[PDB]
DNA sequence: ATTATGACGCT
DNA sequence: AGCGTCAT
C-alpha cells in the first residue's frame, strides 16, 4: 500500500543514435543520404562484413552481420561505405570522433553515461525539478513534443502515423495534473521536453538524428528508445509497464537476451515479463541467484535502481584483430608483426588520450584465440603498461603469450593464432 | 569466415 | 587476476 515503493524517483532517458555509421558516412558523403546504404568492414570476402544499416536498406531485409555480397541480394541498389583500414585493420577513428561529438552537447544538459560508442544515459532528475519551477504550474503544450511518443497511448474510443501519435499525446496531456509539482508523470512529461531540446541541439550542432527513451530506470527507458525508431521519442510510464510487459518476451530486456534469461523461460514455463510478477521474491533468488532473483522480482514491476554512472569516457582503450580459417598466424615473425601492428593503433590511441583527458592506463591485458578453440579468448594475461611505447608493449605482449606456442620449433607457431587483443586499462588522473 | 569493440559479474 | 556473459 502507502509503503510499496513504486520506482518513481528518478527521470531517466536513453538517448541512442540512429544507424550511427551510416549517418557519419552519410554527413561526409552528401551522395548517400536519403538512400539505402550500409557501412562494411573489409571487402575481400563476400564483399565485406555490415555492421551498420541506413533504415531504407532496413526496409529490404539488409541487417547487420550480413555479408555485403548477399545485401546485395536483397537490395541491388544498396550503397556502401568501408570503415577505414590502417596498419592492415578496421580502424574506428572516424566514429569515436563523432561520439565524442555528441557526447559533449549532450553533457550540457545532465551528467550522462557512455554506454557505448552512440549510446549515453541521463538523469534528467534534477533538470526536471528546475524545469518545474520555472513552469510555475503552467501546462505542458503539445508543441513542446512534437516527436514523441506516449506509450500505450491512445487508448479506448485515426488512420496514419502521425494523427496515431498526436492522439495519444493529447490523451496524455489532458490527464496530466499540473499542480502536483512532485507527480511522475509529470515529472516524466518535462523530462520529455528536454529530451526534445537536447536532440534539436544534437541535430542542429552535427547533423545527426537519434532517438530516445524517457522513463524512470534504465531498462525502461532503454526499451522506451526501440519502440519508436527511427527520430523519434518515447515516453514509458510506470502505469503503462502492465500492459506493455503482458506480451514482451523475456528476450528483449537488456540483460535478458542470452542464456539467463533462456533459464528464467525453461525453469520457470513461461514467456513474457510480465509473468514473472507471479513468483515470490525468494523463488526468483532460489533459481537464479540473490542478485539476479531482486533484479526480476522488481524489474518485472517496471522498478530499477541501477544508477546512470557520471562517466562520459571509455573505462578501457583496446584494439583487436581476427584471423579466420586460413589467415591465422603461424610464424613468430606474424605474431610480432600483428602485435607491432595492434600497438602502434593502441600508442596512438593512448597518446591522443592523454593529452584531450588528463590521464594514463597502467595495466595492458593481452588476449589471444588459438584455433579450434569456440570461445571468444583463449587465454588472457596483464602486465604492467609504464610508457606508451608500441614497441615495448608489442615485446611485453609478447613476452606474456610467448609460452602458448606449442611448437617445438622456434620460428613456427602452433596451434595458429585466430585473435590478437590488445586492451590498455588502470586509469590514473596525469 | 562475423568483426571490433566495450562493460561488468564471478570466483 | 583470469574467465565468462551480454551486447552489438
Ligand atoms: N566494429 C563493429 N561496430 C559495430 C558492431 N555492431 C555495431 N557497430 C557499430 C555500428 C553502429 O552504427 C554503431 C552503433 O550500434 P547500434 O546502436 O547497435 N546500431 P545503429 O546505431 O547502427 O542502429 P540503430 O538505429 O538501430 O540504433 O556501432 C560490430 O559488431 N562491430
Ligand atoms: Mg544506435
Ligand atoms: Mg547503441
Known sequence: ??????????????????????????????????????????????????????????????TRSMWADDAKKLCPDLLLAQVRESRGKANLTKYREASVEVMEIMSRFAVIERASIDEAYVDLTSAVQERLQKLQGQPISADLLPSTYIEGLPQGPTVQKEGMRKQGLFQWLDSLQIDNLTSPDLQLTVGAVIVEEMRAAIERETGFQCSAGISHNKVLAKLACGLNKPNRQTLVSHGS?????????????????????????????????????????????????????????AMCRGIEHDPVKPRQLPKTIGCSKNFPGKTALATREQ????????????????????????????????????????????????????????????????????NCNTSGIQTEWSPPLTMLFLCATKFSAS
Open 335 to 402: 605474431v610480432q608483426w600483428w602485435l607491432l601492428q595492434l600497438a602502434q593503433e593502441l600508442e596512438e590511441r593512448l597518446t591522443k588520450d592523454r593529452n584531450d583527458n588528463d590521464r594514463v592506463a597502467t595495466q595492458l591485458v593481452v588476449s589471444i584465440r588459438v584455433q579450434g578453440d569456440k570461445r571468444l579468448s583463449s587465454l588472457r594475461r596483464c602486465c604492467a603498461l609504464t610508457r606508451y611505447d608500441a614497441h615495448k608493449m608489442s615485446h611485453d605482449a609478447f613476452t606474456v603469450i610467448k
Open 241 to 297: 509497464v502492465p500492459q506493455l510487459f503482458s506480451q514482451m518476451p523475456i528476450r528483449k530486456i537488456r540483460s535478458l537476451g542470452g542464456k539467463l534469461g533462456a533459464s528464467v523461460i525453461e525453469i520457470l514455463g513461461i514467456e513474457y515479463m510480465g509473468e514473472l510478477t507471479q513468483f515470490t521474491e525468494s523463488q526468483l533468488q532460489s533459481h537464479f541467484g540473490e542478485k539476479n532473483g531482486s533484479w526480476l522480482y
Open 1 to 62: 500500500g502507502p509503503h510499496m515503493a513504486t520506482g518513481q524517483d528518478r527521470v531517466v532517458a536513453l538517448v541512442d543514435m540512429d544507424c550511427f555509421f551510416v549517418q557519419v558516412e552519410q554527413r561526409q558523403n552528401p551522395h548517400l543520404r536519403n538512400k539505402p546504404c550500409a557501412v562494411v568492414q573489409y571487402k575481400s570476402w563476400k564483399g565485406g562484413g555490415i555492421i551498420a544499416v541506413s533504415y531504407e536498406a532496413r526496409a529490404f531485409g539488409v
